[PDB]
Design a protein around this motif. Structure first.
Motif, PDB file in Angstrom:
ATOM      1  N   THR A   1     -28.290 -72.459  63.603  1.00  0.00           N
ATOM      2  CA  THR A   1     -27.203 -73.379  63.293  1.00  0.00           C
ATOM      3  C   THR A   1     -25.849 -72.761  63.654  1.00  0.00           C
ATOM      4  N   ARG A   2     -25.582 -71.533  63.185  1.00  0.00           N
ATOM      5  CA  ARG A   2     -24.319 -70.863  63.467  1.00  0.00           C
ATOM      6  C   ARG A   2     -24.142 -70.714  64.986  1.00  0.00           C
ATOM      7  N   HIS A   3     -25.246 -70.458  65.691  1.00  0.00           N
ATOM      8  CA  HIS A   3     -25.238 -70.334  67.139  1.00  0.00           C
ATOM      9  C   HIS A   3     -24.949 -71.702  67.768  1.00  0.00           C
ATOM     10  N   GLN A   4     -25.563 -72.752  67.218  1.00  0.00           N
ATOM     11  CA  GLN A   4     -25.407 -74.111  67.719  1.00  0.00           C
ATOM     12  C   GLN A   4     -23.938 -74.547  67.707  1.00  0.00           C
ATOM     13  N   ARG A   5     -23.236 -74.336  66.582  1.00  0.00           N
ATOM     14  CA  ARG A   5     -21.850 -74.786  66.454  1.00  0.00           C
ATOM     15  C   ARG A   5     -20.920 -74.048  67.429  1.00  0.00           C
ATOM     16  N   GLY A   6     -21.186 -72.765  67.735  1.00  0.00           N
ATOM     17  CA  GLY A   6     -20.338 -72.029  68.673  1.00  0.00           C
ATOM     18  C   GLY A   6     -20.447 -70.513  68.500  1.00  0.00           C
ATOM     19  N   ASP A   7     -20.701 -70.037  67.274  1.00  0.00           N
ATOM     20  CA  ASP A   7     -20.794 -68.601  67.009  1.00  0.00           C
ATOM     21  C   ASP A   7     -22.132 -68.061  67.520  1.00  0.00           C
ATOM     22  N   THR A   8     -22.286 -68.007  68.846  1.00  0.00           N
ATOM     23  CA  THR A   8     -23.499 -67.497  69.467  1.00  0.00           C
ATOM     24  C   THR A   8     -23.483 -65.961  69.467  1.00  0.00           C
ATOM     25  N   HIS A   9     -22.374 -65.364  69.002  1.00  0.00           N
ATOM     26  CA  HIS A   9     -22.213 -63.918  68.973  1.00  0.00           C
ATOM     27  C   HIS A   9     -23.276 -63.267  68.068  1.00  0.00           C
ATOM     28  N   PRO A  10     -23.595 -61.979  68.306  1.00  0.00           N
ATOM     29  CA  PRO A  10     -24.543 -61.246  67.493  1.00  0.00           C
ATOM     30  C   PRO A  10     -23.988 -61.029  66.083  1.00  0.00           C
ATOM     31  N   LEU A  11     -24.886 -60.778  65.119  1.00  0.00           N
ATOM     32  CA  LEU A  11     -24.506 -60.517  63.737  1.00  0.00           C
ATOM     33  C   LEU A  11     -25.334 -59.354  63.194  1.00  0.00           C
ATOM     34  N   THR A  12     -24.704 -58.472  62.408  1.00  0.00           N
ATOM     35  CA  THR A  12     -25.412 -57.359  61.785  1.00  0.00           C
ATOM     36  C   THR A  12     -26.436 -57.913  60.794  1.00  0.00           C
TER      37      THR A  12
ATOM     38  N   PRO B   1     -39.299 -63.908  68.680  1.00  0.00           N
ATOM     39  CA  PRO B   1     -38.768 -64.227  69.995  1.00  0.00           C
ATOM     40  C   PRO B   1     -37.364 -64.839  69.920  1.00  0.00           C
ATOM     41  N   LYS B   2     -37.102 -65.668  68.897  1.00  0.00           N
ATOM     42  CA  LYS B   2     -35.811 -66.339  68.753  1.00  0.00           C
ATOM     43  C   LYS B   2     -34.703 -65.330  68.464  1.00  0.00           C
ATOM     44  N   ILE B   3     -35.063 -64.138  67.977  1.00  0.00           N
ATOM     45  CA  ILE B   3     -34.086 -63.111  67.670  1.00  0.00           C
ATOM     46  C   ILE B   3     -33.907 -62.201  68.882  1.00  0.00           C
ATOM     47  N   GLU B   4     -32.691 -62.184  69.437  1.00  0.00           N
ATOM     48  CA  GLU B   4     -32.365 -61.369  70.596  1.00  0.00           C
ATOM     49  C   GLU B   4     -31.501 -60.187  70.163  1.00  0.00           C
ATOM     50  N   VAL B   5     -31.966 -58.967  70.447  1.00  0.00           N
ATOM     51  CA  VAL B   5     -31.220 -57.760  70.123  1.00  0.00           C
ATOM     52  C   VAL B   5     -30.211 -57.508  71.239  1.00  0.00           C
ATOM     53  N   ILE B   6     -28.914 -57.457  70.896  1.00  0.00           N
ATOM     54  CA  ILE B   6     -27.863 -57.249  71.889  1.00  0.00           C
ATOM     55  C   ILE B   6     -27.153 -55.918  71.608  1.00  0.00           C
ATOM     56  N   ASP B   7     -25.992 -55.961  70.940  1.00  0.00           N
ATOM     57  CA  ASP B   7     -25.228 -54.760  70.627  1.00  0.00           C
ATOM     58  C   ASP B   7     -25.801 -54.108  69.365  1.00  0.00           C
ATOM     59  N   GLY B   8     -27.120 -53.858  69.363  1.00  0.00           N
ATOM     60  CA  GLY B   8     -27.803 -53.279  68.211  1.00  0.00           C
ATOM     61  C   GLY B   8     -28.012 -54.339  67.121  1.00  0.00           C
ATOM     62  N   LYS B   9     -27.065 -55.277  67.017  1.00  0.00           N
ATOM     63  CA  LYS B   9     -27.106 -56.340  66.034  1.00  0.00           C
ATOM     64  C   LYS B   9     -28.089 -57.419  66.489  1.00  0.00           C
TER      65      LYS B   9
ATOM     66  N   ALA C   1     -28.927 -61.415  67.387  1.00  0.00           N
ATOM     67  CA  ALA C   1     -28.365 -62.681  67.830  1.00  0.00           C
ATOM     68  C   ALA C   1     -29.488 -63.700  67.979  1.00  0.00           C
ATOM     69  N   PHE C   2     -29.125 -64.958  68.227  1.00  0.00           N
ATOM     70  CA  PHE C   2     -30.097 -66.021  68.431  1.00  0.00           C
ATOM     71  C   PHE C   2     -30.290 -66.214  69.939  1.00  0.00           C
ATOM     72  N   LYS C   3     -31.507 -66.605  70.350  1.00  0.00           N
ATOM     73  CA  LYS C   3     -31.859 -66.741  71.764  1.00  0.00           C
ATOM     74  C   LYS C   3     -31.899 -68.215  72.203  1.00  0.00           C
TER      75      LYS C   3
END
Length: 81
Positions: free
Chosen positions: A22-33, A63-71, A73-75
């Protein structure tokens, strides 16, 4: 087997996935700790068992969880259109 019920781990994980989605859907596609996710998913108190499992099982094999900057994110790619 899960004859008794199905909530421990599974429910929390589904809520994490749904939240990030949901957070990714609205715009915050950024990774989260991990911590940033707990709060929004109502899993701050959680427990060492689940906290650890999320870090070294759920948010790595999912699979839906994408590891980016260690944190975590959603895929979107090759899954959602």
């Amino acid at each position: 087997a899960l004859s008794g019920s199905s909530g421990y781990k599974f429910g929390v994980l589904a809520k994490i996935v749904n939240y990030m989605k949901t957070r990714h859907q609205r715009g915050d596609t950024h990774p989260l700790t991990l911590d940033e996710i707990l709060d929004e998913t109502q899993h701050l108190d959680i427990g060492l068992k689940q906290k650890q499992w999320l870090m070294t099982e759920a948010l790595v094999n999912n699979p839906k969880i994408e590891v980016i900057d260690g944190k975590y994110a959603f895929k979107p790619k090759y899954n959602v259109r």
